[PDB]
Structure formats: structure tokens, C-alpha cells
Amino acid sequence: KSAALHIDLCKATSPADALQYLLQFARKPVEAESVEGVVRILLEHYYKENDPSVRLKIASLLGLLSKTAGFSPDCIMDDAINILQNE
Amino acid sequence: SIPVGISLGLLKREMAQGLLPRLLHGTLIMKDSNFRLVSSEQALKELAEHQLRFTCRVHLHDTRKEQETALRVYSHLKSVLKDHCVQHLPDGSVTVESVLLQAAAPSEDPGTKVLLVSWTYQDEELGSFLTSLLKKGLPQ
Amino acid sequence: VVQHGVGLGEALLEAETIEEQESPVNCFRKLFVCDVLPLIINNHDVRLPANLLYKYLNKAAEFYINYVTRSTQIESKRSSQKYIIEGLTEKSSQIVDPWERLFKILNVVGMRCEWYGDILHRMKDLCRYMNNFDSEAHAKYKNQVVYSTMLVFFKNAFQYVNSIQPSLFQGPNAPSQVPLVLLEDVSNVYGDVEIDRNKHIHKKRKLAEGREKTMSSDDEDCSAKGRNRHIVVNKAELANSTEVLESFKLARESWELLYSLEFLDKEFTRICLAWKTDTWLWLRIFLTDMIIYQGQYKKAIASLHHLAALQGSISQPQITGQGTLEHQRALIQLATCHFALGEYRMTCEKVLDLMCYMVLRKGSDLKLLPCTSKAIMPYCLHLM
């Protein structure tokens, strides 16, 4: 389930509620197609966001998501390093 | 050892610009037993950064286009000075190290054309050689 | 180069147009301007007409406007405007100093006819005799001088747009610049000498609007209030706005010089119509502010409304008479135009619709402030 994130996160507050919800998400595992969906939307929110701590949490769970067992990470890695350059 | 202070902006810029054996030019406001070695610009509020802008004039007899003259001077300096700055400037001017070149308005004499070169004490050792190199002048 | 000659630039422009980028702002056009067209101009063997040089200048202006105000799409000192061009990456379609590229394009245009900061006095001297010259034989160099003055005016307009609305060009992942907004005749209620007579209540509507040509009828005769007056921005409210006020004053002076010529105004209007220069927030806002200051309030308001509607159709969020992340500049501009035109009832209605959006030497003055709610609440209070 990723459309739920697609609704709630953009319709949340910036400082802490997004951070607390993001922390809540980190305690459940994800399936590989849903992994692709979540890395895409998290990259989108990383684009829009400007706070440092929220982006730190975004990146740290992006790392926790890439740790998942079966999927190919290179395709999302391309865009990941693409935004790493301007950070 | 004398403990003194630094402005973190100057220190951060020095580390950032140096890590990619140059000097660190700074200014210290040695107040009553409390010192503060900051950059010059930081002294503006405590007035006392009232700037002392220098300018050395260069006698060139050419009357060519500003952009062409600037590009030729830049190419000539990049040929002479060994890889100081290789860059296309936005305004069609010249600057090596932290000097400033301006094709200012000439004097009241119609038969005199002069180029002006501003710099700081940091870059005067290269600015003097730059002006001596352009003392021969562009091909008239 | 004799194998193709002018074929390479035309093919590159056609390729740029075919990528949903009909106006010359695509990465193909950027590469052509940086490499192909500059090499053709530099090459003595290739000798293009004046129209080709003008088209190259227009392409450079479109690229600069895109790099200075268009959004980046993701799916002593020097400064250059870089953004994601269409069809190639930002650093993979690199152009060294696009402002210098446009200046060199103007210089190449002058070189075709043979005959600025450091040359600011020289540029002013050239501009002095740039609208009273003789015929073509003596106008061979005068056309080059007029093109150079227009290029300097474009650079000043780009700087004003950089200090007016360059925040919508770059994202938040790196340090950037903030936008800003102008204001109407409401700053004459702060100083000791400046007493409350800048707009009054009914006096502004009587003495400002006059029910002029409300349409965007640019390239025409404006008012002459700038002859012995200007937007004298007080340092008591813009003490740290040296770059913003300097860019605004330079843009006002250039706009005062711009209306003097007919070819320059026609070229600017043609560029705005064809390449959609009003679809960029910064350049459109700066041009509208300059036109309003020069005494073209109706056409300036029309251009501002067209830019606001274009932004509303764009992916940027919009609100009904209220400020947003990007609509704050639009709301401030609309409120300032309403105050300048003296529509007292409309200004009160806008304030009522914007109260939630609000933030809790003679004649009128001016100031420099951000495009956020700060420019709306205090100016509205001064008008009230």
C-alpha cells in the first residue's frame, strides 16, 4: 500500500508529524514493487522538502529500503546520485 | 601563545577554498585585552571597514572593442601567467587572482586613452607584473 | 564548415523546436548557441546576415530567461544562469557564462556591420547618440551601438528579474536567492517631510488611471512622469537592498531609454509574443514593474494579469486573492497594481480577501521588500 502515503504525506505538516509518520513506516517491511513505488515518492518529497532533519530521515530509510532482499537497485541509484550532487 | 578569535565565515571559506598552500590574509581588532582576527568586510559595523580601493592606470593606445580587448588580454595573460584563471567572464572584463580591470572613460584629452586596473594588497605582486606586461600595449 | 555553412544552426534550431520547445530554449538550441553559432560567427569564412545575429540573440535571451526563471524539471566574483535544458542535462549541455554568450552575440552582430560595467560611461555615451543618428551609411555603427545598448538593457532587466523573482528558478536543496516585489505610491506616509498625500482616497483614481487602453498594447507612447520624478526608494526600509535597489534603478533607466526607440520596443514585444517571455515569472514581473514605473500602468497591469494567468495554468499552486508558496509574488503584484491605479473599493476588497493572506525630492517615495505578505500588509495599511 503506497497510495496511502501518496495522500497523507503531502497532506501533512512539515516539522514533526511528517517525521513521526516517517519513523512509523520504518518498522514494517516492504515488497520489491512497492519498494520501487516508495523510493519514487520519497525522492519526490525529498525534492519538495527543505528541512535538513526530515531529509536525513528520508535518506536513512531510503538506505533501509535498499537493504531489502530481492530487487534491482541500480535504476533508482541513478536518480539517487543525481540528487546527491546538488545536496 | 596568544588566544584570539576568528570569524567562522572566514575560517569556513579558507578551508573550503584551500583544500582543493596559499595564504590567509586577515585583520585583527585588538581591543582592550580582547582580540578578534576577522576578515576585512566584517569590520564594517564597528565603525571600521571604510574600504581603501586602489586602481593602477595602464596606458594603452588602442581604441578597439571592449569585449575583444578583454578577451585578448585574458588570453595573453593565460599564456603568460601559468594557469591562474582560465574562465570566460560574464561582463567581458579581465580579473586574475582578485584584481579588477575597468575600461573607464578617458581623460579630457582626446589623444589619450587609458585602461584602469584595481586590486588589493594581496594581489599587487601579480598586478604590477600584469601592468608591466600591458605597458608594451596591445598591437596599435 | 563550407560543407553545411548555415545548415548546422538551422538543423539544430529545428531539432530544438521538435522537442516541444518551439521557442529557442531547448538544449539543441543551447548547444547551437554555445558552439555552432559562436563558431560560425567567429569564422571569417561564414558571414551571416543581421537577421541571423538577431535570431541568435533572441535564442540566447530565451535560454537565459529559461535558466533564470523557468523551473528545473526532475523526472572578484562571477555568476551564470544554469538550469535543466530540454533534452540534455544541466552540466552536460554546459554553456560558459550565457550572459557573456549574449554579449558576444551582440558583439558579433556589430562585427557583421563592422564600423556594461567597466564601459558604463562608454555605454551611456553610445546610448546618448543611439536615437538621433543619420541614415544607413552613418547608421552602420549606430545599429551596433543600439544593439549593444539593448543588450545592456537586457542584462539590467535580467539582474532586476534575479532580484525580483529568481526563487522560483531553483529548488531548496542548495542556497539560492529570494524574490521581491515593488510597491505603489504609498511610501509617502513614513518620513517627516513625506506627508499623507501620495494617493489619498479619491485622488489616486482621478489622477492615475483615467480609463486608458486596458489591453496589453505595448510598443507605444507611455506617460512622462519619469522626466522629473522617479521611484525614490528610501534607505530607511531597504537599507540592505543595495543590489535590489541598484537593479531596479538600472531597469528603470533602461526602460526610460527603451521607450525612446521603436525598433527595440518592437523587438521586445515580438519576443514576448513569440517566445512567451511573459510565461517566465521573473522577467514578466520585472518588465511590468518597469512599465508601471515609466507610466504604462494599463499595459503593465495587462501583462501582469497575463503572467498571473499563465502561472495559474502552470503547475505552480494558486489561490483566490491570497498568497501561496509561489502565488505570494502574484498577490503582491496584483495588490500593488490595484493601489497604483487608485481603485479604492477594489483595493479594500483585495485587502478583505487578503487579510488572512496579510502578515501580522518631493512627492511619493518607494522601497524594496520581499514578494511575500510583508509587501502587502504594510502597503495596504499605508494605503488605508
User: What is the number of other CB atoms lying within 10 angstroms of the CB of residue A76?
Assistant: 18
For residues B41 and B49, the answer to whether their CB atoms sit within 8 Å is: yes
Three-class SS state of B41? helix
Substitution target in C76, C95, C107, C119 with the highest count of B β-carbons within 10 Å is C119
SS3 content of chain C, % helix, strand, coil (to 5): 55, 0, 45
Interface touch A83/C174, C-beta < 8 Å: no
Give the burial string for C240-264 (b: 16+ CB within 10 Å, else e). ebeebbebbbbbbbbbbbbbebeeb
Nearest residue on chain C to A55, judged by CA atoms? C173
Distance CA A72, CA A36 (A): 9
Distance CA C376, CA C182 (A): 10
Distance CA B30, CA C64 (A): 48
Query: Which positions ≥6 away from C47 have C-beta within 8 Å?
Result: C112
Distance CA C131, CA C233 (A): 29
* Helix intervals (H) in C262-360: 263-274, 281-294, 297-313, 327-341, 344-354
Chain C neighbours (≥3 Cβ pairs under 8 A) are A, B
Find the CB nearest C78 among B70, B89, B92: B89
Distance CA B110, CA A25 (A): 77
Distance CA C244, CA C238 (A): 9
What is the H or E stretch that residue B17 is in?
Answer: helix B8-18
For residues C18 and C41, the answer to whether their CB atoms sit within 8 Å is: no
- Closest by alpha carbon to C237, among C168, C180, C294? C180
Residue B84 in grid coordinates: 591562474
Residue A38 in grid coordinates: 516508495
Residue C384 in grid coordinates: 488605508
Interface touch A47/C174, C-beta < 8 Å: no
Q: Which residues in chain B have their CB less than 8 angstroms from residue C96's CB?
A: 87-88
For residues C369 and C181, the answer to whether their CB atoms sit within 8 Å is: yes
- Vertex A41: Cα angle to A37 and A47 (nearest 5): 150
* Helix intervals (H) in chain C: 7-17, 27-31, 37-42, 50-69, 98-112, 120-128, 136-162, 203-204, 242-258, 263-274, 281-294, 297-313, 327-341, 344-354, 377-383
